[PDB]
Subunit: 456 residues, 4 copies
């Protein structure tokens, strides 16, 4: 089916409501025209993020009642540990409270000041932890990944020429590691092919260069491989995930995305010495290696959720629900990033707001406007998120200036997607009413989370 | 709007197996083609009943953690008591484990042997308790109610002329009470008008006759009054509910329907002497006047659920979701009972399977086909459920030969309704192919529950 | 150990508090000097009953999240069914919402008007359902069971001479069945020996007479066998329970006691025809045979709880905790029923209130006084509970006029038992201050639940 | 009262296996005689830590079902915020996943390289974050605090003369802040007086120096002030807490201790500029200012828990339960650190095992013996945890050679405390029999966590 029904039933519900346009306009101004600054009670359908907003299952909630809260030797840690060993195939696991805790560890463990880390397009917290540990980020994604309207498969793929070039020009000894994200978030949740993961492993291994995956949406990625990469049509999601990680030296994961939980993450690796060092560090920032700043019940929920994520019908429906929203928007002529990604539809703010320059912060502005007009919260994914260049002080200027309608897993229905698609279409009808924004408060890093603006 | 989006979001899901057609055919065969014999774990969408199958909210689940399990004097009882007093406007309430417990008490309290109870059609358990206690049942519903093809509003209304006639012929002192069900189950879930409730109150009061409501689906009823009865457009669901019960001396309620719970019910009355007698009887069958065969946590969940049921958008969506399924089937020419009721759609299997005689069990066979083709369980409400006359050996032969698609509250989406409808519509397109069934195992009693069949 | 520590940890807690003596005195009068009529919020340590007041485990609560709420074919029903078949060894099970639902079924199924039912001392709801179905109750417990101060083991044992006499005098065809309760509640929670269950089975079987157990505290009973009956010291609690039921034709159970749950019960039998008839009847009163007026989650909790009850250390501690309270009271000279039973300490009201006649309702009075002085709720187990004789109209006059400090399972600690033992001792210090009571309101049956009194 | 009964009852239990001594010896052996390597499932009473091991209430569990999981603007954040503002009287709050997350932020915000931080002794993570950020730590605790045998009140007090000296010698501008821990962990859980907190506030304020509290066990601290400091007898715990923090510029809190939760913490401050800087940093390590690496449900549980912790009877019992264990051990002559603190009893293993040298690891071996004899897990806080100097290869040799019996809140009873005490007392009676240990596996770092031993 193009649009399969939900492969589950509703066990329990939460109420939703809208507040009038008048009240919302007030709300937008008080939050400094930053969607991140509005309040949950004041949002009707909350598409700010798929991070930590997922609906758990009855089985996960049963697990939540069996939290073994012991400081060491918790049954829940053992369960998480064996589940991740089985499904991802890495030797060692260190839990963290969420993904950026695992990134903090990896960046501290694996980077010497002055080294390069190369990856398939930047990410916000990722680039910050790289640069903060003294690395220079090098983007080795294909150029097309940066082309919002260009409909090509596996846009997350690393350009092997660009990786080769980097090795020739910098020397392998000066490359800390390759960071391969699956899927790639800021390109629109775009997948990476198995062929590419293999080619990357083969080339890096020849030069002694390590490869670490950002596993945050690895199940979404595995769906796209099953659906689109020749030869995978009859492999299970689980077989695909396990092969994917077989091409990496470890990974970082925000369990708050594809593990179907509201909190949780981990770091995995194969190297014994790196494991020892990681355990020394986790103690500083997260907790003991035996819980990593998580309750036992959350290690349990994450163990159960990661295994539920492997069910074909679940991930099929997850991705196709997002695709439905994208398809409706596209059929009506609304400009979006193509092809639609695994976790969100990204309105292309540049086409949505032609009359604005990117220095007017179109994406940031549009997010505000969608809120005012519809009560739907969405996230800036453009020049604000891109941050400032640490060499020059200027904004980084990403070609992708996008606005994210991000779908939490197992929370909404197609009828909710229809409510969203209608609101957006209507706002499009007068997109020339969307006004320029400028900063009134800029944080020194990760500025998008809490920055505030005023209309120009 | 014809079909509103869900006025809630999903908090947690209930996992399902998603077994394919070929495995569903084997399950159906192991169940002897009787959907009552299917395992819950093998069913995608379970439309067997809207009784006790509802999804609770996060607020209810919070209440579930706050059970005061005291044998007497529980805080949860006091919460339930004050909620029902507020919402229904009865003086006194006695909790019961579900509806038939309340019906048991009412019939023992209110009936002298040889007296008549008259009502708007009947229900099996309700009428059972009436007759076991010495009453003669008299149907006083409008003749129109019995025409399953007649599309008319407020089809559950009592014919005042039949009630007058009853009083004139039998005498007021020989009428135990009038039993008014809101909505009326056996007509397909048909509402009763406020005008009718007042007319019945006025007539009965003039002769000193009591009126007790079967309040099981009273909120669905209130929604039909708000939608369709002139003058109720500025009235809340809560205002409509409170006015309805103001025309009664008390009620029985299966909370498992419109109170949005999985278990629970109660008996209400205004008469102090009846209340006293009820509390003397509740202890024989159910429990204390302050728990009545319910855990404290369930009194809490029912108190919270009944108040949630008052939200306009909730009950609008509830009824319009069922209407969606009915509308879709009718548009494709599928024969159904009309008009569609608040909680279920009934397929007319007599017309669906015109090539089959009632002796070949078309409703039973059609419910089998539906499961095999879609993973949807439905209930036979036809010749099999009618049972066999054990004196003569002849089938009881009901005019209604139906398959009931009963919709639990807040469990399913419109996409699930599409799975149901598309599958039935596809079956209808080659209806002549549906095979008759014959008994291979038949119990002497309760045959619908455990009978097994094979194809002719 | 005499007093083992709790063989579990506290997973979660509930607050407790006391209200001043002044407030309580007011409270006692408003509740008509009937403890059953006070409110949970107004009680500090609630020893009214061990029925439905037990603390569940983490595992049971995990089960509570996996309620399969289907009308038929619930995984929870299957689990309960197989657990009871395995542990009790009966062929068939019909769930009920609690014990008196199962008694209603058994009494209707197994009694012809005018027949006798003989048992080991009466019980309140049991005797009512017998008499209400037309049976005459005959007490065949040993005389010593009625002697409160007499410390003998296995006081619940049936007097085989008395059973033989009954058969000689009435004829076996006129005995509906023998009702054997394990333990026996009103004798002080007194156990029955395996030897006695065997002797009873052998004698009844020879005459074709059926035996049905009241299984409500069967695990407590099995503990006493393990502890005290020669030859059982090395059998497991589970092996003992399974042998016990091997001597019966079925049973009734209030799961609210030894199954460690807050609601739930069942009826078991071996007879296929009785099973069919039971399923016909359960539909009238409780629900479908597939849930019997219980949520799926409660069938699940009861299945899990019955198996947890089999853990030796759990039941050892359960019984010895009660014994601790009894021992402290006895060491101080407070008069109690001896030996202490499995679930409560029964203050002997006759010795506690020598200056009152039993027509002054000493037990009922004392319960009120303990409340006023201590904030501890306890239950009347004497002449009020005994009810009226249905032949003569006079009070039944039990030799045992007792007041029950009933201990919910897994709820309190020894420190709580110490608080209780101190309060009681102090009140003893002036027991001549306890005043006569008389009726001001008497219900027509089971009068103790809601009767009200005034001081004479 | 010396030892109050539990001011709560048990809502639910956590199941335990109850394995006998012989099976415990095998588990201990499989764990290489290191209690840190024991499986939680094999432990009866787990006194490894009071961090994150507490039992929640029914009210907290209700809050757990009400998680608003929004990425920003969660209702649970607003609830936590207003509770902490009300109870602690700080202007601003930033949630963190636990204490060390808050400490990370504070030290980065408040320390310039080369500056001193002075405090009442130190804690490992706290001091780590101080030093990693460029600070020199100076101990300003009273000399008395370091005498582990000295039984004196308010042993956690800062010596004002040491603080004066520090200011005089180094200059106010070179002091980053004073870090005052309430209670003081390393002295055995020793309280700080309100007099001392005011004196420290007055001195620091006069030189413009900031004061930040480690609020981790501030409620235990407040209880000692109420019990022992003149003039605080008419003051509630809440009033004492609010006054304490009125003498600070902010605090860090591991909610996992006195907030009665399994995960959670926060950073508080009064300074608007610091608040702004903190929110810029929280996003790098933890999450949004409105979740800080916590699920919505955990912010809710912590908000509810902190308010429960204010109940006098709760914290009285908490501290007196630990005191009970200490009192019982001392009465039998068992050597312990004095006076007993709010959350743990420390056994002096140097004196307990006088026949052993520190090189034979008496604390480690004693913790092993305790587990084998009782099923109680305790923590080695001695030479093993001190680690090895990797430069010289020599053990770090601490003056304190202790076994920590750390008491989780609301988990255990006095009977459990008796299991602990009776077992230790029995071991003490034949203390000469306790065998020394030697390394068979030693990691280079974090040795206490995974080292394995065998008997000498
Ligand atoms: K149910
Ligand atoms: K209960
Ligand atoms: K924990
Ligand atoms: K969350």
């Amino acid at each position: 089916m193009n649009y399969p029904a939900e492969p589950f039933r509703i066990k329990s519900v939460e109420t939703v409501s809208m507040i009038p346009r008048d009240e919302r306009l007030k709300k937008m101004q008080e939050a400094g025209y930053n969607t991140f600054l509005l309040n949950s009670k004041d949002i009707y359908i909350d598409l700010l993020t798929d991070s930590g907003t997922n609906a758990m299952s009855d089985k996960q909630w049963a697990g939540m009642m069996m939290g073994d809260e012991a400081y060491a030797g918790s049954e829940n840690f053992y369960h998480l540990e064996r589940t991740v060993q089985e499904l991802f195939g890495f030797k060692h696991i260190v839990p963290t409270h969420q993904g950026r805790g695992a990134e903090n560890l990896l960046s501290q463990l694996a980077i010497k000041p002055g080294q390069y880390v190369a990856g398939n397009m930047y990410f916000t917290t990722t680039r910050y932890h790289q640069e903060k540990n003294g690395a220079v980020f090098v983007d080795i994604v294909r150029d097309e990944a940066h082309d919002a309207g260009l409909n090509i498969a596996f846009k997350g793929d690393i350009d092997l020429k660009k990786l080769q070039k980097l090795i020739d020009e910098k020397g392998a000894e000066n490359i800390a590691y390759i960071c391969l994200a699956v899927t790639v978030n800021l390109a629109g949740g775009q997948p990476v092919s198995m062929a590419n993961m293999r080619a990357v492993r083969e080339l890096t291994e020849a030069h002694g260069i390590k490869v670490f995956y950002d596993a945050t949406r690895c199940v979404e990625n595995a769906y796209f491989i099953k659906e689109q990469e020749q030869g995978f049509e009859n492999k299970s999601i689980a077989e695909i995930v396990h092969e994917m990680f077989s091409y990496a030296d470890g990974c970082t994961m925000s369990g708050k995305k594809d593990c179907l939980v509201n909190i949780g993450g981990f770091l995995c690796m194969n190297d014994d010495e790196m494991f020892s060092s990681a355990k020394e560090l986790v103690v500083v920032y997260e907790g003991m290696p035996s819980y990593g700043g998580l309750a036992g019940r959350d290690m349990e929920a994450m163990a159960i959720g990661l295994r539920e994520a492997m069910q074909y019908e679940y991930i099929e429906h997850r991705v196709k629900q997002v695709r439905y929203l994208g398809d409706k928007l596209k059929a009506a002529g609304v400009p979006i990033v193509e092809p639609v990604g695994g976790h969100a539809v990204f309105l292309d703010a540049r086409r949505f707001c032609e009359h604005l320059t990117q220095d007017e912060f179109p994406a940031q502005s549009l997010a505000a406007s969608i809120y005012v007009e519809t009560g739907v919260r969405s996230m800036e994914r453009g020049i604000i998120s891109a941050g400032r260049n640490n060499v020059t002080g200027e904004h980084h200027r990403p070609k992708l200036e996008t606005v994210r309608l991000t779908i939490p897993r197992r929370v909404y229905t197609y009828a909710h997607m229809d409510v969203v698609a209608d609101g957006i279409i209507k706002l499009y009808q007068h997109k020339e009413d969307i006004r320029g924004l400028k900063f009134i408060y800029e944080p020194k890093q990760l500025r998008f989370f809490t920055a505030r603006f005023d209309y120009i």
